Design a protein around this ligand. Sequence first.
Ligand code: HEM
Ligand code: HEM
Ligand SMILES: CN(C)CCc1cccc(OCc2ccc3ccc(N)nc3c2)c1
Ligand SMILES: CN(C)CCc1cccc(OCc2ccc3ccc(N)nc3c2)c1
Ligand SMILES: C[C@H](O)[C@H](O)[C@H]1CNc2nc(N)[nH]c(=O)c2N1
Ligand SMILES: C[C@H](O)[C@H](O)[C@H]1CNc2nc(N)[nH]c(=O)c2N1
Ligand SMILES: [Zn+2]
Lengths: 407, 411
Amino acid sequence: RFLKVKNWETDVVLTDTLHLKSTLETGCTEHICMGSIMLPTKDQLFPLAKEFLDQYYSSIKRFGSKAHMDRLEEVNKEIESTSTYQLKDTELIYGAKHAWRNASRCVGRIQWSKLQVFDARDCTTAHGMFNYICNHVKYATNKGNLRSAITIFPQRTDGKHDFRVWNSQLIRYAGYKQPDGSTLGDPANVQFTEICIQQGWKAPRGRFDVLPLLLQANGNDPELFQIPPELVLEVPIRHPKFDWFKDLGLKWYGLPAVSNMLLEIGGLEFSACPFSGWYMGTEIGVRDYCDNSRYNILEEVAKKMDLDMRKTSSLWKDQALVEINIAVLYSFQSDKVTIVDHHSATESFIKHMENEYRCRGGCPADWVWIVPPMSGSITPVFHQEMLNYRLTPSFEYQPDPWNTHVW
Amino acid sequence: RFLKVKNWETDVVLTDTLHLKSTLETGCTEHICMGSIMLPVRTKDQLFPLAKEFLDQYYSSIKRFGSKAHMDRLEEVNKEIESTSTYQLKDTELIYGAKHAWRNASRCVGRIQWSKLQVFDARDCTTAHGMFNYICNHVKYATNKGNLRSAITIFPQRTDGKHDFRVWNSQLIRYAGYKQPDGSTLGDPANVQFTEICIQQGWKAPRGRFDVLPLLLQANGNDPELFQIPPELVLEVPIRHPKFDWFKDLGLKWYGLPAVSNMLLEIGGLEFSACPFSGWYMGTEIGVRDYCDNSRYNILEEVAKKMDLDMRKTSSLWKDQALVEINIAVLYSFQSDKVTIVDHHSATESFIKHMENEYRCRGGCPADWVWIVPPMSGSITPVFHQEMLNYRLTPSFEYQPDPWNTHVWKG
Ligand code: HEM
Ligand code: HEM
Ligand SMILES: CN(C)CCc1cccc(OCc2ccc3ccc(N)nc3c2)c1
Ligand SMILES: CN(C)CCc1cccc(OCc2ccc3ccc(N)nc3c2)c1
Ligand SMILES: C[C@H](O)[C@H](O)[C@H]1CNc2nc(N)[nH]c(=O)c2N1
Ligand SMILES: C[C@H](O)[C@H](O)[C@H]1CNc2nc(N)[nH]c(=O)c2N1
Ligand SMILES: [Zn+2]
């Protein structure tokens, strides 16, 4: 019942008690581990609200106070009355920061308490949503000095009036299937790019076209909007060694802003909650540039380096992969856009992990996602045993809207 | 109950029915996942069902399930259990069990080779000296002048737990590690504790950076004895880099035979506590873990210096760059000397095919993603985007405690 975790690089052992407060389920059993699987009413709601309020008033040293009891009573009434309820501003802020704190797959959680929450719960329209988002993008970008942010649109009611951002990120490049049979732009965004056109987007069929926003308000039909270009900060990619690098014509955007997840606080469901931080270098360099199902430029880069691509054992893919990533980090830092390298990030996470064990009795962590997609064993998280479990408040996946939308 | 896994690079979906034959536990619950935890005397009362489960599998695989040969064997073993409180496997059974324990090793990326395992039956061995002789024959055969073959040597099963055969070494071939009074370590830090024991047990340590540890072998529960593997039997490869002439001057070499000897082989409830087995190295085992881990030879720095890398900011990725060159060197040195080795791209590639085939013909393939994915270049290998199901099948390779912690010393 009281679990321990060893770091096999440092012999350090932490003890985990926090997992005892786990509510949701993991996918695994005593018979089968699913750790590597990508995606594993009035009576329902009150205990959920109660759990949240209990941990909320506990965090502000007012557990069992009149304020506490009052609030429990107030929400109880509202639930019994309205079959839902509304979070105080303070609770909303707390829940959001804690949903990030509890994200077991996020290596960047040391920053968790420094989260800016924009309350867009008074939003009614897709134009409204667009305004709130533009403000989010401008705030978080900050001329390259990135600040973490979340913007929270109204909570789901009866699933009929859902707010949704259809884009997977606020800022992503377009993806077009070609007559050549290949794929122009971003392969991950092909199907989306179609629905954009299906709702009327005038695609400038290019390779690095910033997608339009496709916003759905109150369960209505989604609408298109173009993010003002001067709010979309981009970084031209150049190698601090290879002058020929720039000739590959690569850029990436500075703001990673995930906009397709569902934020759960005290049983309430926020289906539109776009949030942002800054990149870890490998996210663009390894996954965005080199993945087979993405911009897959490895061959080209290795070719220009004239590596021996005849045999896998020359490790030419490896050699290039590093250069590419060195450049990503190089450009971003040159242009003074915030970015973190996998070395610094993972180091910061081990620290945070120790802090959380010390100040909270645990830290749920998904090793499969915390270990960066390159140089794994030369970062400190590789030899860190981790425990994975689900705390609430939380960020959850949710179905792609087109599959769900009552049109 | 069916389970589907998906590959997110290729959208290939596979269905696992084999996990239904899972016996042992994973360490996980519905409330917690321990998939990244390193490590998550048996009565007749429980032995026969284990024997039966095993014998059933075995007779299915030879297509004689429910045959008379099958039933008499079940009767033979039953009778021998209540009679003798244990039982002996036929050779046919031992070979099968061993191949299958490998085949079930959910952490092993080299399993495509599982059926070509050479099994040496050392169950007639009675003494440490005998153990040495068997081991030498293993090393010689497995090595085969650089053309490595898979092998496992199997010593007598455990009985009352008081007469165990053990190989105290973690691997048959390994370099000594010596702690110095200034706190620094000469040799392989992973082996410091074990080196001390050897020295204590009488070993005369040359005290260099690459001393081949002596074998420390326990028979029938007796105190272990030292033996030196004949050097002519220990194949080694000097590490040089194909472009970098200064690399050879780093003074590095490694052995060619990865031969793990501290595990436990479980077949049909029988426990084989000394079962050294061997394959060949995937390059990153030496290149990434054995050299570049902070708790090992830790040559990243020196290689980086000699490359003239900006080691001032980690944002320079000097660690990454040097790590790759070192791995390039390891593969180069090995292939130059015609000593069998595999790179992580080829190995992970082969695994995916093995896996897909295992799903078709066996209805599943237990796989531990945390261990299958290589310690560098993870996402540019096909296994990274591969979803996997982890579960334990028997026969299996299990961990056991270090014998120096459990051994009752005779004197
Ligand atoms: C500020 C610096 C941040 C960094 C460096 C960072 C880094 C990362 C990385 C590397 C991943 C793995 C994704 C991949 O490998 O491509 C991840 C996942 C995740 N991040 Fe963080 N993040 C940051 C901020 C945030 C913020 C502000 C939030 C929300 C408030 C957040 C919530 C999450 C969640 C929920 C996941 C898991 C996504 C999933 O399950 O698919 N992160 N993050
Ligand atoms: C023949 C070529 C082989 C290759 C390339 C190979 C590769 C590997 C690698 C890279 C690992 C992970 C070790 C690490 O990450 O440091 C591993 C684990 C393992 N291998 Fe294989 N192996 C081979 C042969 C064998 C053989 C012959 C057996 C047994 C008969 C075997 C049984 C195992 C087991 C049980 C593990 C997991 C050990 C543990 O749980 O700690 N392997 N293998
Ligand atoms: C839904 N699946 C098809 C895709 C899931 C997936 C795949 C690859 C990376 C993912 O990361 C999501 C994610 C979420 C939040 C982030 C916050 C900051 C940051 N730098 N990256 C972040 C990345 C998710
Ligand atoms: C007990 N833990 C502290 C360490 C166990 C461990 C750690 C790292 C690698 C390990 O490798 C096991 C192992 C077993 C069999 C192998 C067969 C062939 C091969 N190339 N590597 C093989 C590797 C074991
Ligand atoms: C903490 C973690 O379980 C441990 O360090 C594991 C991680 N993954 C690994 N993966 C491989 N292939 N080999 C290892 O030794 C380890 N070590
Ligand atoms: C199959 C596997 O679950 C999937 O490819 C995961 C593996 N680990 C990952 N880890 C991170 N950080 N991001 C990812 O997208 C993935 N993908
Ligand atoms: Zn699990």
